[PDB]
Amino acid sequence: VEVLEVRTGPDAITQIEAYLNPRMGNNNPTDELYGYSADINVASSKASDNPNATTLPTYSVAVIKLPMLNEDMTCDTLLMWEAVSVKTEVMGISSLVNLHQGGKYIYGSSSGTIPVQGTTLHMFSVGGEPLELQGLVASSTTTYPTDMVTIKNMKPVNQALDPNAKALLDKDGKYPVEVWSPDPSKNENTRYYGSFTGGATTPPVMQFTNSVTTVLLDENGVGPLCKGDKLFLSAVDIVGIHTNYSESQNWRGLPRYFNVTLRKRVVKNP
Amino acid sequence: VEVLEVRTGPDAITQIEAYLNPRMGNNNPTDELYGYSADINVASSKASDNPNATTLPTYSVAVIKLPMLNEDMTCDTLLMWEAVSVKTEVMGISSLVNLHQGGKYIYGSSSGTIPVQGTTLHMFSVGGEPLELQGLVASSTTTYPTDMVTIKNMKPVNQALDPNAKALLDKDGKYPVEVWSPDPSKNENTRYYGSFTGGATTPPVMQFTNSVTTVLLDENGVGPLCKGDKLFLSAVDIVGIHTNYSESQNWRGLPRYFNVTLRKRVVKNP
Amino acid sequence: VEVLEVRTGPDAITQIEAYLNPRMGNNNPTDELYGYSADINVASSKASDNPNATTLPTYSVAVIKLPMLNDMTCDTLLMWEAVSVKTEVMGISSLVNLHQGGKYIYGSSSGTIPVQGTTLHMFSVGGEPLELQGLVASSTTTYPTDMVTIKNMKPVNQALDPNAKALLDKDGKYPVEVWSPDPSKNENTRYYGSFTGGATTPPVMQFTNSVTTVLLDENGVGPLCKGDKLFLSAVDIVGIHTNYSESQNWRGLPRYFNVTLRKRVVKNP
Amino acid sequence: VEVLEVRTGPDAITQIEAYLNPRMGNNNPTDELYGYSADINVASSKASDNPNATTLPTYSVAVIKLPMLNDMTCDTLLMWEAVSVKTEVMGISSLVNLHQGGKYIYGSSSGTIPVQGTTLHMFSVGGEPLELQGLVASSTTTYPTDMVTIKNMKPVNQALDPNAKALLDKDGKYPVEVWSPDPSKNENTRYYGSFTGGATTPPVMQFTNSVTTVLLDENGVGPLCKGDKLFLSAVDIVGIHTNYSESQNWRGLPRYFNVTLRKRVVKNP
Amino acid sequence: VEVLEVRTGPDAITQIEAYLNPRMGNNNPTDELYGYSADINVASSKASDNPNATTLPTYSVAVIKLPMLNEDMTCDTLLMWEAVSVKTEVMGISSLVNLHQGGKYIYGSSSGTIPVQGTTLHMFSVGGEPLELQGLVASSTTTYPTDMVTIKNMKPVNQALDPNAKALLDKDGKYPVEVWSPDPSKNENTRYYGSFTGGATTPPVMQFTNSVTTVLLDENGVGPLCKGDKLFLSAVDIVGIHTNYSESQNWRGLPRYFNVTLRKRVVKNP
Ligand SMILES: CC(=O)N[C@H]1[C@H]([C@H](O)[C@H](O)CO)O[C@@](O[C@H]2[C@@H](O)[C@@H](CO)O[C@@H](O[C@H]3[C@H](O)[C@@H](O)[C@H](O)O[C@@H]3CO)[C@@H]2O)(C(=O)O)C[C@@H]1O
Ligand SMILES: CC(=O)N[C@H]1[C@H]([C@H](O)[C@H](O)CO)O[C@@](O[C@H]2[C@@H](O)[C@@H](CO)O[C@@H](O[C@H]3[C@H](O)[C@@H](O)[C@H](O)O[C@@H]3CO)[C@@H]2O)(C(=O)O)C[C@@H]1O
Ligand SMILES: CC(=O)N[C@H]1[C@H]([C@H](O)[C@H](O)CO)O[C@@](O[C@H]2[C@@H](O)[C@@H](CO)O[C@@H](O[C@H]3[C@H](O)[C@@H](O)[C@H](O)O[C@@H]3CO)[C@@H]2O)(C(=O)O)C[C@@H]1O
Ligand SMILES: CC(=O)N[C@H]1[C@H]([C@H](O)[C@H](O)CO)O[C@@](O[C@H]2[C@@H](O)[C@@H](CO)O[C@@H](O[C@H]3[C@H](O)[C@@H](O)[C@H](O)O[C@@H]3CO)[C@@H]2O)(C(=O)O)C[C@@H]1O
Ligand SMILES: [Ca+2]
Ligand SMILES: [Ca+2]
Ligand SMILES: [Ca+2]
Ligand SMILES: [Ca+2]
Ligand SMILES: [Ca+2]
């Protein structure tokens, strides 16, 4: 679609806000361990790697419906909502500042417990359509739960780049992060931003503020354009691993807030 | 409230300073371990987790009364104090540079003792009303002391985002950091800045200088506006954990200094 | 070659995109451990050090053929000039995995240690092969003969031997522990590398589609593609995987490139 | 004083330079362990904590007498204004030493553990003594009477007691664990500090002669030297050296200052 | 000498390149462990600390002879070469990415070996005369090899700043880093840049690129001026410690490349 100028005048700007709850494996709000995975079940061998669905963190996604812009669809030009900037925040960070939760002792049984630590993964995206994904796994011989969306008919090539392994992030809590990542060869109409630090016991590091805005405009001054007046918000915020007294382990996630400013953009009627 | 222009002229600027003492759990200045929590008392299980009030760090808050500005409340326009910038500093940082305090030896009994280390959490906020808070916990089955302000009738939803778990930071030493964090969906009239590094034994890192100012104006050039001529200052500065000889542990906190510059802002009378 | 002005007008600009699969040692897509090295075989001594080819990560290289620009007698020619690149290490979140068969973090009730330790990231974009300098940990290492390594090593190759030079002209052949970008050459290539060592170091990576690197030099000139060929080179070693028996495999990830090129006028030589 | 404009013309600018040696506890240059604290002596309990004077790092301070500027009648006077400073921790590379007596890294065939753990770096440049705020880890600690510490301590002193104030007016007398710069004062000093804690943390330091710190405030005014005196203050604890017996000493390094000053006109008070 | 303006015109700019090989202790290219120190030999006691020359890393220095500028030395003004900017690079960084070198196992005898790690020291300097040095040691009772250049007649004062402990970096592989550092009270005619990270097992961190230039001009816009048409390049690049199977240890250094751009500067004839 040919993109023209920004539409000026009163009522040309709008703003939405939303939060996405984490989807660490216990994904129902009545689950005792909502916001965590179940105890990790580890592969027995290369050939026998059957991770339980509840142990696998997935991506969060929400579709926000925006006000309808075009009365009749037959004028030479149309309007689309253009995402211009976002304020985003990982919520409840200070919940990890807690040394009394049941778990593994830091020293002996007189000490506090080890807080959430280890691998972290933070991703947010804002687009005018679903986030486009690339499949890649640690091991093609893992058998994934069938009620999740994973790579069909995996082979060892899927341990690196197979250009046939593509998907859309179109379902909340279904696409495992260990299988899918943002596809940089597409996503022309989405801006995504991601951060990873690995390790078993790494100290998690996070900032929180209401003073920072990310501008979503591309090199040409154009932000994501919302097809069918729909805005797509995606996230994952794995903040580390909680270790229990018995040494079993649960992934821990946190929710993410989005505040997106949008404006009206003229496009040519296709 | 329709915000208008900055009032210029002599005496249009004022400046306040304040310090907030840490509320680590021992919050009475006659407490032997004032500036620390009591020995952390750890849950025996998921179901049984009763942290003592003295073991839970809370937010500091102070209200600064500013000179009154409006004689007539008849006038078509009124003046409010607008917070423009802040210098803020964590005080007594070098008190941590101490290897003789009674505790746990670094190596054997000929060595110095382990200094304060582990999880850190730093936050300051400057606003024209109480900081708005969102509740989220590590465990919804925790029983919090009834004399603290925490989430009423928790369910497992409270381990992630429950949109009903909201509060105002309107009491000093009452809101546990492990339960509450700044709400990014509100706080239009407060600037907050936060930094977290987790981990069991992580070395703390801190800077101190009198050369750095934070500017508090939003993207329209408007800082926090002080309702009823009150300026709200909030903080928490957990600098880590002290470990005792028996391996019991206390949170350690430090005081925070604020120097705030304010100016007169014209607003439309409501 | 004398470099003249940029050629303006419609069709003055083109873009390409490619990805390079990692070459960690298992370099065939049907290899069970594709994207990993084989179990590291360690030297029993300084004198006795014969690493298997499957255990030695090598540089990835791709040559992209660009639209033919030039008749070859005009007094000025056109060359494709690489102006900027968006590049991305793909599959980063694949490391966010605690269930893979391996070594337990704590006892046997816990998750397994994820990929961690030494990392090496390099990308380059050039108008000819990346020029290489040879330097090794040990000059007494015997390398696999079917790889390209330093000929007739002496202890001088543990430091700078001005004679140990090569071109990155084959994919999966030049070991990273032998070869590195030659800063005394490479006038026509831009390279960018970072290294963090250690055995257990947590890996750190970012991913976004918002970042572009400008390739122009201090005279405003990017790499100029000789014979309309664009050279893309990479290595992305994201750490070490540890197996249950404590054997270890290097782990690598693929890299994406999106390069923008413009027509540059040059004086005919 | 009412501060007026900068005085221009020939000879309006000056430079001084100085070094301050560290005061870690062994503060006499003939001390066998000069530049180190004596072996750390640890408290037996909350009630009993009697650190020896020689175990407690203190701030360094020097007063530089500047050229006499003024007669005192004139409606306006000149003061030296500290404009900028180049400052350097000297002898950083002295830490790059694994043969020194100490605790083995692995077994007795290995090198010894180098200086590591808690570090504290501070420098200040002002026109009067640095103003200090008292705060300690323990109010029941008994400090050496020959040092300057907080009078009549109570548990409030484990946090902010607004009465606990002092001036850094003596070299090697004010313990860093008792005093820090007071941000509620120090209008006429600029101070800069960084702290990293932990018991075994690797120290990190840079050294260059290319970096200057500008000392002007948001009104373009630097510290003004009362009575033509310039105050330089510092502490540079670079970590802890551990002996074979596992007893431990703080290690400090000297700091160099090069300050540029100019003449500032002020109203006679 | 009085420094005047930059000389303009054709042929006013020259460019040199050079490499400096590391001087870790095994400093002869035929040495089996060239580019490493010999096994560290640890002090028996404070009184008995005799490090072997081969165990002590020294600075690298090279003198580059530049084209002769002044035809008649009686003219009232003269030209000097002025170092304007440098591109510099540590070479062979990726040689460290090697887990099969003989050494100490990361885990048991089935694993890779521990790569080079621990204390790093990086310095480069570009000057128009020898880099000026200040003496400072960890221990004044250390007995250094007489074949090296160290502090004469050490006393305890040399554990801190002795103003009489000065030297010039005027010989390659002779001035140990543990005794000498750049003197900030001098070096008006040299620019030096240094970086240190200690510890015994710290991961080394290095970058490499050909896209970065350091500008050498001072605040008056004057770079180092090459006395007698000599350009002084100095370096040390200790990238860590290699541990052998028997647990003995060797410093590891890497060579450094320089590409310095120079221009002609007018000076008044003294
Ligand atoms: C992430 C998180 O919140 N982890 C909890 C865990 C988990 O709920 C559990 O591991 C499932 O993943 O529970 C922790 O406490 C449990 C632990 O102390 C075990 C003993 O190791 O006992 C459990 O209670 C038992 C009780 O002991 C028995 O008398 C009874 O038969 O059953 C109870 C419930 O099964 C504790 O809940 C843990 O450390 O694993 C606390 C963590 O914070
Ligand atoms: C990078 C990676 O994927 N590593 C795998 C490894 C490698 O595939 C393997 O080390 C070759 O380099 O395999 C891991 O699982 C193996 C391990 O559990 C060993 C026990 O030490 O047994 C292997 O299965 C055997 C099995 O024991 C026999 O019954 C069978 O007949 O032969 C099988 C094949 O050898 C496991 O596959 C590993 O931890 O080493 C899992 C890693 O994820
Ligand atoms: C933050 C802080 O200052 N921690 C102290 C602690 C705390 O005061 C205490 O743990 C309460 O939270 O005390 C430390 O010293 C005590 C320790 O040596 C214990 C031995 O386990 O003894 C205590 O003194 C006892 C004494 O031993 C008895 O004879 C007497 O009957 O009672 C005394 C007081 O209970 C020490 O105070 C500690 O290591 O726990 C020192 C820390 O710095
Ligand atoms: C920096 C470096 O490359 N270190 C080497 C070292 C050094 O060359 C050496 O330690 C002197 O600094 O050698 C390493 O391999 C040796 C090691 O396995 C030892 C056993 O601890 O044996 C040496 O070979 C011996 C062999 O074992 C004997 O049977 C024979 O009689 O003598 C041989 C030579 O002494 C190995 O060379 C090491 O681990 O120390 C490998 C390091 O990479
Ligand atoms: Ca594409
Ligand atoms: Ca809102
Ligand atoms: Ca060259
Ligand atoms: Ca004040
Ligand atoms: Ca001097």
Side-chain angles (χ1 to χ4, degrees), chain A residues 41-43 49 137-138 156-157 159-161 163 177-178 180-181 185 187 190 192-198 202 247-249, chain C residues 19 21 29 31-32 34 36 88 91 93-94 96-97 99 101 107 109-111 202-210 251 256:
Chain A
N41 70 294
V42 164
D49 187 5
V137 294
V157 67
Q159 283 162 197
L161 210 294
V177 311
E178 77 170 44
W180 305 102
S181 58
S185 71
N187 288 301
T190 288
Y192 65 85
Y193 309 84
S195 211
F196 162 80
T197 302
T202 315
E247 299 183 339
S248 60
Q249 287 178 313
Chain C
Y19 60 87
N21 271 323
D31 290 345
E32 188 172 38
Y34 187 52
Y36 297 84
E88 172 106 310
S93 58
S94 73
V96 178
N97 171 339
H99 69 86
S109 298
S110 80
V204 176
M205 291 178 281
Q206 327 299 326
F207 53 108
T208 184
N209 60 351
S210 62
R251 174 51 164 165
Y256 169 86

Side-chain angles (χ1 to χ4, degrees), chain B residues 17 257 259, chain D residues 183-185 187:
Chain B
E17 79 193 347
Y257 171 85
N259 185 329
Chain D
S184 72
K185 307 198 198 291
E187 301 85 352

